[PDB]
Nucleic acid binder design. Structure first.
Length: 70
RNA sequence: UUUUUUUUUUUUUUUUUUUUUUUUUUCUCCUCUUUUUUUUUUUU
């Protein structure tokens, strides 16, 4: 939690653009038919893991660019 | 006290052959309406 919160702190001191999408989820029972629909949401932990893997993939790409130029 | 005679079931067998699924019609034809076309992002 702390690590993610403050990787966020830094890379927003840089300043990202965090926006959203109009996404909805669907539950399907035994009969395979619509019990209900439910709007889904972005959760704190989604943001955490999103930034952890952003930084990860970022260092990955750095390594692999400086390692193989063209 | 009533003798004698009036044929019967066609003859024949020791002939060659080098093709081939099907088969043969039917004309030109007014697709109705918020749009450029949205787009990063993350959790599968």
């Amino acid at each position: 939690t702390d690590i993610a919160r403050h990787v966020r702190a830094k890379r927003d001191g840089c300043g990202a653009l965090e926006l959203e999408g109009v996404e909805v989820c669907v539950q399907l029972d035994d009969k395979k038919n619509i019990h209900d629909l439910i709007p889904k949401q972005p959760l704190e932990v989604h943001e955490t893991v999103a930034e952890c893997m952003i930084l990860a993939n970022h260092w990955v790409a750095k390594k692999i660019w400086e390692s193989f130029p063209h």
